[PDB]
Design a protein around this ligand. Sequence first.
Ligand SMILES: Cc1cc2nc3c(=O)[nH]c(=O)nc-3n(C[C@H](O)[C@H](O)[C@H](O)COP(=O)(O)OP(=O)(O)OC[C@H]3O[C@@H](n4cnc5c(N)ncnc54)[C@H](O)[C@@H]3O)c2cc1C
Ligand SMILES: Cc1ccccc1NC(=S)NCc1ccco1
Length: 279
Amino acid sequence: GPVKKWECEVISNDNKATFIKELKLRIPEGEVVPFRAGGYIQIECPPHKVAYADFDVPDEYRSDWDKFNLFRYVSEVKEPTLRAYSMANYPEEKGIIMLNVRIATPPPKIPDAPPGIMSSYIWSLKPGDKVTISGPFGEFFAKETDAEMVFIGGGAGMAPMRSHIFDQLKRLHSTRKISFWYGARSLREMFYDEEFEQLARDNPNFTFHVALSDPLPEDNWTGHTGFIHNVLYENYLRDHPAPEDCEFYMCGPPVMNAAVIKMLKDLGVEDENILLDDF
Ligand SMILES: Cc1cc2nc3c(=O)[nH]c(=O)nc-3n(C[C@H](O)[C@H](O)[C@H](O)COP(=O)(O)OP(=O)(O)OC[C@H]3O[C@@H](n4cnc5c(N)ncnc54)[C@H](O)[C@@H]3O)c2cc1C
Ligand SMILES: Cc1ccccc1NC(=S)NCc1ccco1
């Protein structure tokens, strides 16, 4: 039972945030990748050498790239490798595989480490390039109950978050109470917000909340500030009659995963009601 593979063509590879690209791949026509919301594929790369200076980083994000001297990096790979990336589209969005891919730069305290192999390769891709994906795979699946669902996301965790939420509202036509809580550093780091706002207008049972930890003055931000674990508690769980009866679905950067799960455990939520997708 060898894993299925598809050679896909790159449609677009646009920044959605300073350090996240939306890689959109065209599935070969007439074919289906039979994935589930929350699932993922693997991408492979050939041997290559790519310069960060050749990345298509748009106007709104170049100042930070220049500030951290990121355009100097080069990534050289002599052997093919594989990495997993989660679908941001949901299964009824046919014909494409949408990914959200964080650029895995060298650590700040070890800035001369090799850049991340597969994310650097992905960020080098241009429309018309070909990439081979394999799978699909999955473990981060929704529980099918009537319980309230609480989705918490950060960074590239937006991908399974979007997949899950669209799957509930558009394919399952779910009437369950569903809320999505997304933490980001500032306004330019938020994406897909218009989609979720439209979903909230069309689905009374769905609500969407963004917390910005470090909003810029020019963001003109009057929404919630701080970290998403505190915003979720202070603006919702603190007067929820029974948070323990909720299903929590977590996917963010490690610091956010830990802080949210600690908050939930401190509320008495049982491990069985907390599902984590750790990238
Ligand atoms: C099921 C699953 C789903 C995932 N979904 C997503 C997703 O949707 N989006 C996403 O962006 N990621 C996702 N990930 C993570 C993804 O698979 C990769 O791990 C990620 O892209 C980084 O891989 P890389 O090849 O770019 O970096 P790697 O080459 O694996 O390097 C990782 C980090 O280590 C650093 N490093 C390397 N060598 C050294 C050294 N000597 N000293 C110090 N530091 C060093 C690199 O600079 C880099 O920051 C997922 C992972 C899993 C398991
Ligand atoms: C990681 C991250 C990404 C985007 C926006 C904010 C954050 N920071 C977080 S979630 N910090 C958690 C926290 C606060 C105190 C202890 O842990």
